[PDB]
Amino acid sequence: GLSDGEWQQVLNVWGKVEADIAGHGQEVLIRLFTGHPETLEKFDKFKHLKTEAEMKASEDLKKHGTVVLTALGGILKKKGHHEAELKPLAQSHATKHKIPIKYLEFISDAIIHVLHSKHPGDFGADAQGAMTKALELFRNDIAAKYKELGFQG
Ligand code: HEM
Ligand SMILES: [O-]
């Protein structure tokens, strides 16, 4: 797990995201979709976004970005005691949305990239280490639920 010091770093970094949840959410999803087009296909409502300009101009994409980061933020604030919050998310993503765990790795990487992109020089090595541990814990706990369901893709 993460140490108290690491969780404090995670939540300090998260404060940066909370100042502009929509902007961060939008950029994380655009980073995901442009770097891994196959992920866009999992969203029937975003499949029409044929270009990054259309992605940038989509208010519904920003809306979903807000939903995604709000959910992740809720989980992070639990500092690992997130079973009740994480289980339903893991189950909807495996059973309803059919999201392979690889795509969760992709979005975790996108979050780290967006943090550096929006806060260059202000997302330190310690902060990156802590946030990475938090995202890995998140991903790994979802993976355990995916294994329970026998879900691969
Ligand atoms: C940080 C990771 C993620 C978080 C916190 C997150 C959170 C959410 C939430 C809260 C919802 C709405 C409630 C629900 O259906 O469970 C949702 C819906 C959805 N998610 Fe995610 N998600 C994550 C990653 C992904 C990834 C990586 C994909 C696909 C590559 C994905 C695909 C979907 C789809 C298709 C929906 C339904 C969208 C719609 O048509 O309204 N999610 N997600
Ligand atoms: O999502």
Side-chain angles (χ1 to χ4, degrees):
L2 281 71
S3 67
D4 298 308
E6 290 170 332
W7 278 120
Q8 178 174 49
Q9 270 298 71
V10 172
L11 298 188
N12 181 60
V13 166
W14 196 255
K16 302 185 189 306
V17 175
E18 294 180 333
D20 182 14
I21 292 291
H24 282 79
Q26 171 201 65
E27 287 187 39
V28 166
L29 292 175
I30 289 176
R31 178 66 181 191
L32 176 66
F33 297 155
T34 60
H36 310 277
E38 67 271 35
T39 61
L40 185 72
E41 295 312 299
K42 291 293 176 172
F43 290 88
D44 297 312
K45 71 178 178 175
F46 294 131
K47 277 176 183 186
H48 68 282
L49 293 174
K50 309 304 181 185
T51 66
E52 183 176 328
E54 297 187 307
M55 290 180 197
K56 292 280 183 174
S58 176
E59 292 309 316
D60 195 56
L61 184 158
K62 295 178 58 177
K63 183 183 177 180
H64 193 66
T66 293
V67 165
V68 170
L69 295 193
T70 294
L72 179 56
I75 287 166
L76 295 172
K77 295 191 182 181
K78 296 297 184 179
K79 298 166 65 189
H81 298 291
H82 57 218
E83 169 64 22
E85 292 75 19
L86 187 143
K87 187 190 168 175
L89 188 63
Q91 296 200 324
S92 74
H93 283 64
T95 313
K96 187 171 191 306
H97 311 309
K98 310 298 185 186
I99 309 307
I101 192 76
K102 184 72 171 183
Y103 293 6
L104 283 300
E105 173 191 10
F106 296 158
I107 204 177
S108 294
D109 287 345
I111 289 166
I112 293 296
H113 180 83
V114 171
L115 286 167
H116 278 296
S117 182
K118 291 183 78 59
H119 312 280
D122 186 45
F123 181 38
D126 59 343
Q128 177 173 337
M131 185 58 77
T132 294
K133 279 185 66 165
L135 292 167
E136 285 175 324
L137 178 63
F138 169 72
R139 189 157 79 250
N140 194 248
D141 283 352
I142 286 167
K145 304 296 181 189
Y146 275 20
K147 180 170 174 285
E148 299 185 340
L149 301 167
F151 180 68
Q152 286 286 354

